[PDB]
Amino acid sequence: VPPPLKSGIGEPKKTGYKFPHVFFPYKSRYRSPHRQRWWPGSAPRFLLHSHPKRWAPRRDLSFAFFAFHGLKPFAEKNLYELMHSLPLRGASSYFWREADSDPWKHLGRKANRLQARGVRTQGRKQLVFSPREIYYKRRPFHALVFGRLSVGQLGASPPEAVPPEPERAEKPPDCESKEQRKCAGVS
């Protein structure tokens, strides 16, 4: 059965609807554009169903309860959550996205799609983000971070690192790139 609908933190109480959509009794193949994404092999809607209201008994309440965001796994920690614990709010640092452990790329119903090449039978140039201005609306998962986006070349070391690039000035300080997953930096 599908999970019950819940409102995210920072939102007033709303009135639940009686039916999922207008064509509830009559039609069945019609699907709403704002349908929930809970089946394995998908991603949330960011700010629609990612952070639902959290409740627990009085006994379970504690300081550590509030720090759940900052202890999330690597596969679910966003940029906002990552920059919150870093020195200087992660200012004057570098960040990049590692698209190697996505939920849909390992698990899901459509996890065996046919690509243009076929199957994978076997130093990169990944983008680097330099946060300049940081503004937190709804901590620790919400912020308007403005930074300079540039390109950088990876190294030959075992881990993913950035040797002597960024080199080229791509665009002036703009909005963030992605909000799914991010890595650390040299700083």
Binding site: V22, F23, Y30, H34
Partner: protein, 144 residues
């Protein structure tokens, strides 16, 4: 105001061959939250807001329409206004190139681009050739 809201003329002429939406597509717009609503796109306020802005000012009366019979007119044949001025000799040689063996070897001798498959390079080259034949036939049909 009430019949038709403020719609720029530029976006009306371009949207000519746009297919209308289906039954399910209509419900998407109507479904809450209505995040597809643009600036001054409200179907509740736009229909009355415009009217009030014009109420302060004068209203031009409708034009006086006087019925008048239309005189009879007979059919008259006219020549084609659009007739490209091109000699038939030029088109004769051009047809032998696209339909000749030279077209096959021309596609192979093409420069590739990063991020594109080998078949794409030939497909785009063939598409450009297909555009020239359409004009040749169109010009010939009009002339005849």
């Amino acid at each position: 105001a009430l019949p038709n809201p403020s719609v720029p003329r530029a976006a009306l002429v371009a949207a000519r061959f746009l297919r209308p939406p289906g039954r399910f597509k209509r419900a998407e717009l109507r479904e809450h939250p209505r995040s597809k609503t643009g600036a001054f796109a409200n179907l509740v306020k736009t229909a009355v807001r415009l009217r009030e802005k014009a109420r302060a000012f004068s209203l031009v009366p409708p034009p006086r329409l006087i019925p008048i019979p239309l005189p009879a007119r007979k059919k008259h044949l006219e020549s084609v206004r659009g007739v490209p001025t091109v000699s038939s000799d030029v088109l004769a040689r051009r047809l032998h190139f696209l339909l000749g063996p030279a077209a096959i070897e021309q596609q192979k001798a093409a420069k590739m681009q990063r991020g594109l498959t080998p078949y794409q390079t030939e497909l785009f080259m063939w598409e450009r050739q297909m555009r020239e034949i359409r004009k040749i036939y169109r010009a010939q049909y009009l002339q005849r």
